[PDB]
Scaffold this active site. Sequence first.
Site, PDB file in Angstrom:
ATOM      1  N   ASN A 183       0.809  -1.215   0.000  1.00 30.81           N
ATOM      2  CA  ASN A 183       0.000   0.000   0.000  1.00 30.81           C
ATOM      3  C   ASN A 183       0.845   1.269   0.000  1.00 30.81           C
ATOM      4  OD1 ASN A 183      -2.556   1.365   0.231  1.00 30.81           O
ATOM      5  ND2 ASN A 183      -2.125   1.712   2.408  1.00 30.81           N
ATOM      6  N   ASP A 238       5.776  -4.743   2.477  1.00 29.07           N
ATOM      7  CA  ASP A 238       4.539  -4.285   3.101  1.00 29.07           C
ATOM      8  C   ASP A 238       3.417  -5.325   3.029  1.00 29.07           C
ATOM      9  OD1 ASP A 238       3.069  -1.997   4.307  1.00 29.07           O
ATOM     10  OD2 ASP A 238       1.931  -2.117   2.418  1.00 29.07           O
ATOM     11  N   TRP A 239       2.222  -4.941   2.589  1.00 28.92           N
ATOM     12  CA  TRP A 239       1.157  -5.932   2.529  1.00 28.92           C
ATOM     13  C   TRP A 239       1.445  -7.057   1.551  1.00 28.92           C
ATOM     14  CZ3 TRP A 239      -2.096  -7.063   6.107  1.00 28.92           C
ATOM     15  CH2 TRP A 239      -2.356  -6.092   7.090  1.00 28.92           C
ATOM     16  N   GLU A 282      10.971  -4.173   4.724  1.00 26.57           N
ATOM     17  CA  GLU A 282       9.895  -3.427   5.375  1.00 26.57           C
ATOM     18  C   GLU A 282       8.601  -4.229   5.345  1.00 26.57           C
ATOM     19  OE1 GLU A 282       9.307  -0.178   6.784  1.00 26.57           O
ATOM     20  OE2 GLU A 282      11.402  -0.531   7.347  1.00 26.57           O
TER      21      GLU A 282
END
Length: 295
Positions: A38, A103-104, A127
């Site tokens: 995102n 991320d996602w 991350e």
Amino acid sequence: IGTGFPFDPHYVEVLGERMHYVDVGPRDGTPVLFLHGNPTSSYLWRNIIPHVAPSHRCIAPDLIGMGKSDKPDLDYFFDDHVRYLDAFIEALGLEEVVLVIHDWGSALGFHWAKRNPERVKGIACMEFIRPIPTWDEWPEFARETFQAFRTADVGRELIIDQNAFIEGVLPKCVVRPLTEVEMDHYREPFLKPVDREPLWRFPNEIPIAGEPANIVALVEAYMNWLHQSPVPKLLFWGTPGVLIPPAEAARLAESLPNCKTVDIGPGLHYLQEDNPDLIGSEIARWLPGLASGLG
């Protein structure tokens, strides 16, 4: 750093929706699957893929409701993304794969890996989503903003009405200044405010201080798997970082089996926008060793 997106569009029909994806490099061999988060898309991997394409097939889908993929009227909970990615992978008939996640995209990748361990040859991550025990552990500069994103009414006003995730979070989480053309590439999929739903649901799904419980359980589950898995892992991290600060990367270098870490220098969350060349070159140098003889 390149701002162009020199990749021919590819589409596949998945669960009644069309999903867009990049597919370059050799037509055979173990594919490297890149998963964005995102509020990005495959555009995020544009400068990394060229480092890998010369040796391996590269597949980079745009998650449902994002990038150039269709945008159905869903609530876009993590589960919706899980269903669409699962179907995407099967639609392309992928067998074994190497994951490059963020991320996602990392929550999706790790969750898929946990459920299909025999099909994951290696995992390159950066991350990534992990359980955040307390707000204390969320970086101060972005703490109130994410608390606001998760606050009734306020969060939707910011992300949907004001497009704060694209206009604020994204640029504020790249150390170097994103250019106008790069920002316009990221803005393109969400020029209709209603389509910003996934951008708001995502931050409300992050496992922070035990909420939401269902996601916390799912994330704890794949972390438990990750810590016990012998699968080769490559973790890129930056300073000060966001989800994976230097101190956390140092801890993971120990707690994650068969793990190699790479310091990319200055970076916050979208590390791919700060040092794509090192991320790409290191992945390329890491892939060959994932093989076990001819086969």
